[PDB]
Amino acid sequence: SPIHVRAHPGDVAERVLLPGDPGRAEWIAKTFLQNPRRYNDHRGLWGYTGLYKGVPVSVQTTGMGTPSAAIVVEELVRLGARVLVRVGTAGAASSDLAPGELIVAQGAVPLDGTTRQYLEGRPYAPVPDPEVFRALWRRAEALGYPHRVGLVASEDAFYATTPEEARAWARYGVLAFEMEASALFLLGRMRGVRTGAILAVSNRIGDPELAPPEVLQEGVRRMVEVALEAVLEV
Amino acid sequence: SPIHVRAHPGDVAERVLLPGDPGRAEWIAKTFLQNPRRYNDHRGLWGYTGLYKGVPVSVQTTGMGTPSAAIVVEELVRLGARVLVRVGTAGAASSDLAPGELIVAQGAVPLDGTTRQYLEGRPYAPVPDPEVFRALWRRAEALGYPHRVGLVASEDAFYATTPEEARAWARYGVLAFEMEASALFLLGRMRGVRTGAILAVSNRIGDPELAPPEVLQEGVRRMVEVALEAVLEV
Amino acid sequence: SPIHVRAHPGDVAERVLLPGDPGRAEWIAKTFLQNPRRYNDHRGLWGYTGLYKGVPVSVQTTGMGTPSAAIVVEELVRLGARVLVRVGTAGAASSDLAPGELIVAQGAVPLDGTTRQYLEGRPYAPVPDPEVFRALWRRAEALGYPHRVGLVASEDAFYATTPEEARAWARYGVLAFEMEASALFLLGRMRGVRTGAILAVSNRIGDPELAPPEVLQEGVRRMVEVALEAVLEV
Amino acid sequence: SPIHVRAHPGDVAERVLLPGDPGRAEWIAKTFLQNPRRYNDHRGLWGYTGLYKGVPVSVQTTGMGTPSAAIVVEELVRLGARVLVRVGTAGAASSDLAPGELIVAQGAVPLDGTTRQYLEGRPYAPVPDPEVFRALWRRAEALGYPHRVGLVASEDAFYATTPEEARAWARYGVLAFEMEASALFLLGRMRGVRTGAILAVSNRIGDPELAPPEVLQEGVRRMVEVALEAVLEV
Amino acid sequence: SPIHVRAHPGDVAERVLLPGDPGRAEWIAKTFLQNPRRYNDHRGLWGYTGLYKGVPVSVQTTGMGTPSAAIVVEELVRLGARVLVRVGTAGAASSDLAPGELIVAQGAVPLDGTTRQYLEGRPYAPVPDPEVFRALWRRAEALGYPHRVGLVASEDAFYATTPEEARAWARYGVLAFEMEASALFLLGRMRGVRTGAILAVSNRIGDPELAPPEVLQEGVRRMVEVALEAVLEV
Amino acid sequence: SPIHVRAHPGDVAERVLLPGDPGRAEWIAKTFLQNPRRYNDHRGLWGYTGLYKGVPVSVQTTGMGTPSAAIVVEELVRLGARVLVRVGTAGAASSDLAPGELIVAQGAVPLDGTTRQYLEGRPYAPVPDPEVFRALWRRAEALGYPHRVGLVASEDAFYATTPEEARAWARYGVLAFEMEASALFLLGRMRGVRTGAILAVSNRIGDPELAPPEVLQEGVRRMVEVALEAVLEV
Ligand SMILES: Nc1ncnc2c1ncn2[C@@H]1O[C@H](CO)[C@@H](O)[C@H]1O
Ligand SMILES: Nc1ncnc2c1ncn2[C@@H]1O[C@H](CO)[C@@H](O)[C@H]1O
C-alpha cells in the first residue's frame, strides 16, 4: 500500500477528480457519486470512489501545494488512476476575472520547486493532456457556464505574491494563481497518464478574504459538473 | 517603416503565416494565394500577401532562431498582424514521430534565450492562443490529415542537442525540436495577438540529412492548408 | 479569521507544536494536552489548543510541503503564535541513521521552492531560533533520550530523490530529508518569532514503506515530550 | 552537404567574411571580389566566393541572431573555413559612440541562449582569435579609420533592451549591442578555427530608425576593407 | 607538505584558531600561548602552535575571502587539524549591532563563490559543528561577555554591498557580513572536522573606517579567550 | 587611508604590478627596482614602490582569490593607480602547456563569486585593457620568450577542480586556471583603469606539488620583466 494514500488494489477508479481541499472532496462524493466509499483518510487525504452515471469515478484530496499534490498523483498512478482532473480554486491575477468564473487551464507557469526538482532545473511548459483539456473546454461550453481559457501560474508562497507582481504576470497571459496544476501536468507526461485542470476563481490576489460563500459554492458546483462530464469523455 | 521588415501600412494582412524558410514562403504564396505580392525582401525576410478564398492572408518569413522570429513578429504586430501561425518543420525527439508527420503545437518548452530576455529569467509556459490551437486541431481532423498534438521544445543551439539529450526530453513529453515557437507564443500574450504553430517533422534528431522531398513535401502542403483554413476560422 | 486556519486571536496559544499529519496532531492533543479543544478542521488542517502542565499549548497541523506549512505558519503568527516547534518525521540520508532516532534540526538545506519565492532566489541558511534550538537539545539530554543534532534538507519532490542522491547529500552533512523545516526557519526570521524543529526518523530514503508502528511510536512520543518541555522553557 | 548552407567543400575559401544581412553579402561580393560566384542561396543565406587581391575569399550570410549564426558557422567549418571574420552592425550603448564609428570586438558579453546551451550554463568569456584580433586592430590603424577597441554585447531580444539597460552595461565596458559575436567566438575556440568581429555602429539603443543611409554606408565600406585586408594576413 | 601552508607533520595542533589577519594571528600566539612557535610564513599565511593551559593550540592565518580561507582549511585538515574555530571581524548590517560586540555564528549565508563551486550550485545551509557552536555560546556566558547568537553572511565583494542591501538582509536574520564563515562551515561537514566561528563587529556596512582600535580591542580579546576555552571543550 | 592596504596616495605609483604572493612582491621589488621602499605590510598585503629605468613603479600584493584581489585593486585605484598588471602563476588545464611557459591573458572566464556579486549575476567577458594587452603581447615577442596568448579561468575553489573538468574547459579554449584576473579585468573597466595580466604556468591541474624551483623561477623572471617593460609603454 502507498505511503500516503493508503488504498488497495481495486479502490481507485481509472477516472479521478483532484480537489485540493478534503472538504470539497467529501461534498463531491456525497453530492455526485452513487455508492460512495471512502477508501482513505490517512493524513487527511480523503479519497472516495463511487459511480457517476454508471461509470466508476474517484475523488481524491491532494492537499495544498505541488509537494503535497505530487505525492498524491504519483501514488494515484500506482493505484491505477488513468485520467486525473484537478478541480480547485484560484486567485485572479487581473481584474477581468471575477470570483465565480471558471478557468480551463491551458497551461500552468511553473513557479514551484516540485516541478523544478523533477526537471532538475530545466525549463518547461506544463500543459494538460490535450484530449482532457479539449473535453473540459467542450463540456464547459456545452453547459454554458461563464468560463475562460488560458494560463494559470502554480506557486509555492501563497503570501509572497503582491498585487503588483500579479499584474506584472497578467501582462504575460497569467489569468490567475493556484498551487497544484504545474506538478500535475508535469507528472501527467512523465508517468504517461491523462491530466487536466479546471478552476473556480475564489478571490483576487491581495484580498484578505475569499468571495461570499454563495458565489463560491456555485462556481464549484459548475466546475465539478464540467470535470465530471469531461472525464467520461476520455 | 520598421527596421527589419520594411513594409508600410496596408502591406501585411490581419492573418499571417510564419514559415522560417523564405523559400517556403515564396512557394506558399505562389501555390495557395490569388494575386500574390511580395511586400518585403530586405534581409531575406521575404514577405508576401495575397487572397486565400477571398480573404487577405500574408506569408512572412521569420528566419531561423527565436532572436530572428522575435524581430519579425514584433514588427508584423506593429504593422497590423493579429493572427499569426507558424508553419515550420521540426526534428523528432522520439521514435514514434515519423518524418512527414504533423504536430499541432500545444505548448513550447522555452530553451531559448529570447524568451528568457523578454521574461527577465522568470519561469514560463509558452502556449499558443487557445482559439488558434483549437482551430488548427479541428481543421487537421476535418481534412482527415493524421496529426499529433503536444509539446515541442524551442532551442537556440541546433548542433548542441544529442540524441541522448533528446530521448530525455521525450520522457517529459517533448515530441520534437524547433527554433521559433516559444517566442511567438510569448509575444502572442505580451502583445495581445493570437498565435499558433503547426509543424511538419523533417528528420529525427541526430540525422545527417533531412527526409526525401516527396514524403516531407506532402506533409508541408497539408500543414499549410490546415494553417490557412484555421486562420480564416478565427 | 485567516483564509485557511479559520480561527480567531484567542484560539491560538503563544507556544505551538507543528506536526505535518493531522493524525499526529489529534494524537498529541488527546495524549499530552489537558482539556484540548479543536479550533480548526478546515482543509483538514486540524488545530488544537489545551494545557500542558498548566501552560497553554497549541498543536497545529501543517500539511505536507513548505507551501502548505508556509500558509499555516504565516496564519499562526497572525493569530499570536510566538514559539513554533515542528514535530515531524524524516527519511535518513545514510544507513547509519535508524528509524526511531531523534533529530534536533540545527538548520535545513533549502531545496524547496517556497523559501526560494520568499527569498527571490537568494542564497540562505535556514536556521531555528537559537534559544529554541538549544532548549530542544537540552530537554533531549535532560530526559536521557538519544538524539542527533544536525542538518536536514527540506525538499519539494518526495518521489524524485533517489537513495544515491540522498547519500551524496549526506557527505555535506545532511542527516535526513523532510518537507517543512526550511520555510519554518525562514519565516521565523522574517516574522520575528522563535521556531525550532525536532524529527523522528520514520524511514531510510528509498524504502517502499515506513517502519513498523511500535518502533516508531516511542520515538514520536519522545519527540513530542521533548518539544513540549522545550517550548515551556522559552 | 550541410543541412542549411547547401554548399560543398571547395565552394568555400579558407577566408570568410560573415555579414548578417544577405544584401550586404551580395554588395561585398560584387564590390570587392573578382569573379564572384554564389554557391548558396538556400534559406536566403546567400554565400559568395571569389578573389580579393588574388586570394580566394568567401562572403557568407549568417542571418540575424546567434542561433542562425551558430548554424552557419558550424557548417562553414565543415566546408573547411579556417578564418571567419564577422562584418556587421551594432547599436551604441554609450553616447560617445556615434553612427558610422567602427568597433573591433575584443570580447563579446554572452547574453544569448545559443552560447548558453553550448556551454551548458557555464560562465565564459567569448573572445576572438588572438591573431585575427591583432590583424583587424592593426589594419584599422594603418588605414587611419577612427575606431574603438573593446567589448560588445550579444543579445537575443532586439526589442527588449532599453536605453537605461544599455547605459548600465556601458558602465561595465560594453560599447555596443549586436546579435552574433558571442557564438562565433565560442565556436571558434571549440572547433579550432580563427574568428574575429568588426562592427559599424548603425544606431543607438532605443532609436526608432537607423542612421542616414549615407553615413552608415561609408562605415560599412571601411569595415569590409579592414576585414578583407585582415583575413589575408592570417 | 601542502602547497600554501608549508608545515611539517606534527606542526599543526588538533585545535586551531583561524584569524583572517596575520597581524592578529601573531598577536594571539604571543599573547595567549605558552612557547609560541611559528611553523609557517609562506605567502604571509602565518601559522603558530603553542600551549593553552597545557593543551596544544595552533593559530593559522586564513587571508581574506572564502577562496583563501578554503585553501588554508583544506591544508590544515590534510595536516590533522580536528577543531577549527574562526576568530574574525565583521560588518554590522543593522543598527542593532554596535562595534565591539561579539557574534557567535549560528550559521552563515553563502553569498560567496567558493561554497558555490564546491556545491556545484546546489542550495545549502552552512552551519558550525553543533558542539563547537554550543561551546562558544556556553563560554561567552560563563565569562560574562555580552554577545549575540545568529546568522552572518559570507560574501566576496567587500566594496559592492551597500547599506540599503545590508538592511535588506537584516530582515532575513543576517546580523553582519564577513568573508570566510560559509566555506569553513561547508568544509567542516565535507572534511569531517569540527568548526565554528565567533566574530567581533569592527564596523557598520558602508563605514569609511573601522571603529577606534580601543573599543574594538577589548572585543577582540574577549573573542579570542572564548574561542580558546571553547576548542578545549571539544 | 584605505581599510586594508594602509598607504598614502604618494606611496603608490601610476604603474603597478600585482603579484598574489607577498614573497614574490618583495623579490620583485628587491630584484628589479632601484631604491625600493615598502609602503604597507598590514594584513600581509606587502606593497612596494621604486623606480624601473627611472619610472616610478609599485608592486602590491593581492593575496589569493578575487575577493582579496578586488579589495586591493579597489583601494589601489582610490590611491591613484592608473595601470595595473597582474604577474602570477596558474595551473595548466591541458597537456600542451608546460611549467615555466608564459600566458598573456586575453580574457578570463569568470568562475568566481566576486565578479558575480559586482555584476549582480549578469553574464560577462572579463578582458584586459586593449593597450595593456597589446603591450604585454608585444614585449614578450620583443624579449623572445616562449608564450601563449589566450583565456584563463578565474576560480574560487582551488581544490575543487578535477583533471577531468580542467580538460572539459580546455575544449572551450581555457589554457590555465588562476584566482584573480577576472575581478581585475572587471574592475579595470568599472573604475576606468588600464589592467592586464600575465601568468607563469607553475603546475598542471591535479598536481600534488609545484614544479622545481628553478624551472619556475626563470618563468617568473621573464614574466616580471615583460610586465615591467610593458607598463612603461602605457
Ligand atoms: N490567491 C491565491 N493564490 C494562490 N493559490 C490560491 C489563491 N486562491 C486560491 N488558491 C488555491 O487554493 C489554495 C490556497 O487557498 C491553493 O491550494 C490554490 O490552488
Ligand atoms: N532537428 C531540428 N532541431 C532544431 N530545429 C529544427 C530541426 N529540424 C527542423 N528544425 C527547424 O528548421 C530550422 C533548423 O533547420 C529551425 O528554424 C527549426 O524551426
Ligand SMILES: Nc1ncnc2c1ncn2[C@@H]1O[C@H](CO)[C@@H](O)[C@H]1O
Ligand atoms: N523519506 C522522506 N523524504 C521526505 N520527507 C519525508 C520522508 N520521510 C518522512 N518525511 C516527512 O513526512 C512527510 C512525507 O511522508 C513529509 O511531510 C516529510 O516532512
Ligand SMILES: Nc1ncnc2c1ncn2[C@@H]1O[C@H](CO)[C@@H](O)[C@H]1O
Ligand atoms: N540596437 C541594436 N540591437 C541589437 N542588434 C543590433 C542593433 N543595431 C544593429 N544590430 C545588428 O544588426 C541586427 C539587428 O538589426 C543584429 O543582427 C545585430 O547584430
Ligand SMILES: Nc1ncnc2c1ncn2[C@@H]1O[C@H](CO)[C@@H](O)[C@H]1O
Ligand atoms: N563591512 C565588512 N564587509 C565584509 N567583511 C568585513 C567587514 N568588516 C569586517 N569584515 C571582515 O574582515 C575582513 C575585511 O576587512 C574580511 O576578512 C571579513 O571577514
Ligand SMILES: Nc1ncnc2c1ncn2[C@@H]1O[C@H](CO)[C@@H](O)[C@H]1O
Ligand atoms: N592549479 C591552480 N589552480 C588555481 N590557481 C592556481 C593554480 N596554480 C597556481 N595558481 C595561482 O596561485 C594561487 C594558488 O596557489 C592563486 O592565487 C592562483 O592565481
